[PDB]
Symmetry: C3
Subunit: 339 residues, 3 copies
């Protein structure tokens, strides 16, 4: 909500309270788990008009879990999601630095549209596919003002030598290009980065370089939303072998995501989707599915501040998955107040 | 403070900064402890008018301790207190889900009125008596609009299998009924729930079911506040034996709380109170008091945003308490800015 | 930003998003380190007009790091910086209690003006020189209204027996006096406190009392900022021997800080500075420098909401420093949105 707008500065303080519960049998062997998943969000987005051509901006967003006790586990799953500041100049472009979405999410965003689940390959702290720390991102809209609908971006990812391989990365560069015309959109994005010493020390994955790319097609008009993503990764998708209790990265993955939605005027937005991510040449295993499901769901929008939803994942992962990926279904039910 | 109210949505951003210090001799053997207890609160409460009969709402509230260093202990005692969203329909009722007050607090709230202390049996993460995660709560005001002053509630508590017995619970159901008429109020509340495997594994407490109930009587008018609570619990009140360093739950407790306060027009609000909670059939011990004190205190309200207070607990727990419950007095002094 | 002002209460909700990166060779052997240092701040400052002479106030401020992953390390470096409430009466003075700046910072603030670095001796949780918990502070402006420009303060520091010696303190008292006249300012501040048993148990440092004092001179007018601080400490400055992996406090330090800055009308604010802190009579070592550098930097202010800066520390610590204090240079580059 815009709570301040004076002397060329405006501040949006936003957030949401999400009452959320997951239903799965037993849910350790399931897609999403079982039990209370309630959380809240808080953030600010500010923008200052420096002069007629130049705007400055900043954003911070935090996740507060609502499914922890007030005891020792109080902080589990709490984190800053975004924290960056930048400048945008006329049609020249924008530049921001901090914790922000990786540039391959410019493609993966096309299918990251489900009521609760979906967007499975947009891992956090995973090079260019999700939110990540220490990215400098340059974006250009409408090719310097010269070509309506043609956008591009480049992103410089600085090394993050963390205490876990899962959350680390080396230096890298990625980019994206998109074109939009009368409801349709097409996008491509690619990034490559060094892997850290700790990452190369892991049992699963082999190589000095992580690579991720994705393409997207969408139709987004007349209350209809259809989208598809195809992508591949090298030494970039995090995996765990639940049998050996061993972790690392998949040598290769092939990822497909499809989504179809409709927005009724009375507020209901049904969703159907399909997601499959398959790993290849995993040490000790070979080829193995990481994600494989159909989705059926719906959101009901009471208005722009209140909604409820149900999201059902019909899991197609089989019970003898060689990595021990959960095979059972999950249903989420949520009630959302947002501002 | 209401900081946004536009297009059928309003947002209250609220909080407080509480400078607070406890004085006890030595305070490990005392009621409240000794030293700095400063903290702050931040929260939002939003409400959207969906149509003339239906409102949506959401609330989140956090506790930031102000008595930690900026080093390793920075997060001690920090937590989300509340996080829920809901809908309220005409006189049909309200329904919310998330982290919220347990329904037996509908009774215990009557005496939870002291300047700093009091409300001793309203434990957090303790089935139905305090704030707890994963509760679906239905509330009805004035019996569907048909009976002025008659309210009721039912609450479904979902299992929380946590890493400690203290903070866990099984599935349960509780409810409350209250009636208010010309200053007087009467309330009753009861809940029962499964205990988790981890809870049943503890040395103290025996049984597959936790139960809590409480009754309340109050007079709240003409600047006078008088209230009484009586309740009992089974396998629900958390206890520790400081001698064996053993923990669990009391097989039975019998709880009484009394409070008397007056609000002077010039701002002073004196308080006197009495609290006793006695445990029964504790393994290895038998009968033992958990809480036993008289309180004298006062709050001075400068206005609705600024207050100060003093709260003195005259502890009646004896020095040879079989569980090692502290026997010394505590005085709290606080200065509160709130918005 | 002031987001509420009604019925004698006003609330400022403020914060910033700081995209920040440090460049050093290798940065473990450097002044500041290497890599992403992005963070955000959020706070409130409220003030209520109780009557014509009396105001109540409260403030809370938090640091959210933006350079952590969303995994296990999510909370590293997160903390409450400030949390206090108080009253201010006409010209009689102000009194606040909670987590606030130590009173010797009344002097050290003079030189704590650099774009990113500087203020090296204003350690957090270090008696009277930085932010600290459990301080009751009385401040007087213009000597009860009788002497324009003459201010003073006294501060009572309550014992904080923490789990680390570094973050602990005993009871203490400190104070400050300052005089300002036509651009010039002079200040002196001194505090002494008991050391806790845990502090006295450390290998480095010897004595039952910590002492800190500092003097300051400044000129702050006509777009010019010049300032100098001189101070000394006893058993108060925290130190680590990186060779023995041993920690404690310096028996004595002698500290000097100099700063010179200019604010151009077009927005640029160049900075030059010098800082030296030398420890004396360190057990096993003798005399040893803790800080020794020249600084050159600049901030560019686009307006009151957006800035960028560069801060270069030309480190003069030598490579064979007996405590293993880093000897390499560091450059910070930042982009700041604030509200
Ligand atoms: C105003 C704040 C701006 C701070 C900028 C921080 C610089 C971020 O460093 C990014 C380093 O990335 C360089 C990429 O180097 C290429 C590495 O090779 C891997 C690609 O295949
Ligand atoms: C276990 C119960 C949870 C199941 C949720 C059911 C969701 C109800 O919505 C029905 C799905 O409707 C499919 C329509 O898909 C929209 C596709 O639109 C494309 C039209 O061009
Ligand atoms: C819109 C979000 C709503 C999500 C609802 C979550 C469902 C919560 O589950 C509560 C389960 O409680 C059922 C009670 O079962 C009785 C157990 O027996 C113990 C009582 O003696
Ligand atoms: C160690 C010092 C701390 C003690 C705090 C003293 C509190 C001062 O207030 C006096 C208490 O006054 C008792 C009045 O109780 C109100 C009962 O009103 C019922 C009238 O119907
Ligand atoms: C309205 C809240 C106010 C609460 C006040 C808390 C009291 C803080 O305690 C401070 C104790 O400091 C006393 C100083 O004693 C001197 C110790 O000797 C060391 C100095 O050389
Ligand atoms: C590695 C590159 C980083 C270096 C940053 C360069 C900073 C540019 O500013 C130039 C410094 O100018 C010095 C002026 O100092 C101001 C003193 O004013 C006193 C006048 O009375
Ligand atoms: Mg989503
Ligand atoms: Mg209370
Ligand atoms: Mg600074």
């Amino acid at each position: 909500a815009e709570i301040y707008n004076k002397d060329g500065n405006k501040v949006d303080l936003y957030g949401k309270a999400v009452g959320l519960h997951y239903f799965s049998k037993g849910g350790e062997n399931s897609y999403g788990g079982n039990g209370d998943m309630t959380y809240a969000r808080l953030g600010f987005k500010g923008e200052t008009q420096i002069n007629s051509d130049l705007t400055g901006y900043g954003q911070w967003e935090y996740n507060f879990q609502g499914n922890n006790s007030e005891g020792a586990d109080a902080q589990t799953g709490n984190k800053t999601r975004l924290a960056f500041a930048g400048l945008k100049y006329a049609d020249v472009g924008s530049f921001d630095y901090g914790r922000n979405y990786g540039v391959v999410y410019d493609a993966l965003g096309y299918t990251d549209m489900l009521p609760e689940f979906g967007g499975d390959t947009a891992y956090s702290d995973d090079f260019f596919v999700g939110r990540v720390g220490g990215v400098a991102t340059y974006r250009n809209s409408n090719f310097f003002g010269l070509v309506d609908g043609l956008n591009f971006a480049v992103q410089y990812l600085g090394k993050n030598e963390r205490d876990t391989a899962r959350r680390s990365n080396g230096d890298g560069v990625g980019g994206s290009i998109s074109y939009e015309y009368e409801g349709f959109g097409i996008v491509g994005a690619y990034g490559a980065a060094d892997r850290t010493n700790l990452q190369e020390a892991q049992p699963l994955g082999n190589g000095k370089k992580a690579e991720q790319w994705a393409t997207g097609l969408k139709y987004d008009a007349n209350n209809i939303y259809l989208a598809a993503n195809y992508g591949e990764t090298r030494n970039a998708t995090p995996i765990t072998n639940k049998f050996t209790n061993t972790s690392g990265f998949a040598n290769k993955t092939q990822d497909v995501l499809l989504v179809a939605q409709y927005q009724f005027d009375f507020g209901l937005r049904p969703s159907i989707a399909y997601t499959k991510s398959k790993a290849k040449d995993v040490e000790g295993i070979g080829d193995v599915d990481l994600v494989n499901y159909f989705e059926v769901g719906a959101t009901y929008y009471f208005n722009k501040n209140m909604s409820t939803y149900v999201d059902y994942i019909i899991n197609q992962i089989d019970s003898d998955n060689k990595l021990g990926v959960g095979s059972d279904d999950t249903v989420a039910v949520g009630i959302v107040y947002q501002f």
